[PDB]
Amino acid sequence: MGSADLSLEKAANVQWDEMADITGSSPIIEVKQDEDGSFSIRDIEETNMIAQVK
Amino acid sequence: LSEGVYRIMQRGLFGKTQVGVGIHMAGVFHTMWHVTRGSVICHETGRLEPSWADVRNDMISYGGGWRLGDKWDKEEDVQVLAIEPGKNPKHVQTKPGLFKTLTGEIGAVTLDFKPGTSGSPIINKKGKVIGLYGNGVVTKSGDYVSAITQAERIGEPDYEVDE
């Protein structure tokens, strides 16, 4: 036979790095729906807000 | 052949380019559908042939069924072992959101890594893969969000007493 498509290259192993950064940890709520063959996806972020006066 | 995280390279005119990421665990190589699209993957030992796929959920397994059974529990921090092309492996932790869709709730990872990372493992605190990074959604020029791509429990309530 004769073919060739894609190769493998090992990079790392499954391990939990405790010193990883937690920046960008937005727990956004995404509502995905479709109506007429298209798909409509809204994303609702719930950012915390402390009151402030000017 | 050995358990770990593998880069999925494609030979071209200018050499091999990382098109995606895959995880070989418990003797089965797990990756994303849109990455390999069913093409066989060869390594020193031999060529891997696909065994199962879910095109709607963008998943495909090589050499057997999906053995990654661990799913994400809500309100628990996860880490993405992003394998960016050329760059070294990078671990980033996040508090996942939710993908409110018909048929269930899928974890929403807000991390935006470079293209080609599709298939990077999503690991829980116990050091086990609970999903795959790569299949997600982008906002209007905004922050990409990837769904925690996992096979089983794709539509189950995850709170019943039956199993």
Author numbering:
A (entry chain A): 46 to 99
B (entry chain B): 18 to 180
Copy text from the publication.
Non-structural (NS) protein 3 is a multifunctional protein that has N-terminal protease and C-terminal helicase domains. The NS3 protease, a serine protease, requires NS2B as a co-factor for enzymatic activity and folding. The NS2B-NS3 viral protease is responsible for polyprotein cleavages between NS2A/2B, NS2B/3, NS3/4A, and NS4B/5. Due to its essential role in the viral replication process, NS2B-NS3 protease is an attractive target for antiviral drugs.
Construct eNS2B47NS3Pro had seven residues from the NS2B/3 cleavage site inserted between the NS2B cofactor and NS3 protease. To provide the structural basis of the self-cleaved eNS2B47NS3Pro, the crystal structure of eNS2B47NS3Pro was determined at 3.35 Å resolution. Using molecular weight analysis of intact proteins using LC-MS, we identified the presence of a second cleavage site at 3 amino acid upstream (K128/T129) of the conventional NS2B/NS3 cleavage site (R131 NS2B/S1 NS3) in eNS2B47NS3Pro. In our structure, the NS2B cofactor adopts a new conformation, where the NS2B C-terminus is not fully folded back as β-hairpin. Instead, the NS2B C-terminus occupied the active site of neighbour NS3 protease in an adjacent unit cell due to the presence of the C-terminal NS2B/NS3 cleavage peptide sequence. In the current structure, the cleaved C-terminus of NS2B (126QVK128) enter the neighbouring protease unit via a side tunnel and occupy the active site of the NS3Pro of the dimer unit. The occupation of the IAQVK peptide from DENV NS2B C-terminus is mediated by interactions between the P4-P6 residues to NS2B 85SIRD88 and NS3 155VT156 residues and P1 K128 to NS3 129DF130. As a suboptimal substrate, glutamic acid and valine side chains of P2 and P3 from eNS2B47NS3Pro are rotated away from the active site. We also identified a small hydrophobic pocket that is exposed only when the NS2B is in the partial closed conformation. Hence, the structure reported here is suitable for co-crystallization/docking with allosteric inhibitors.
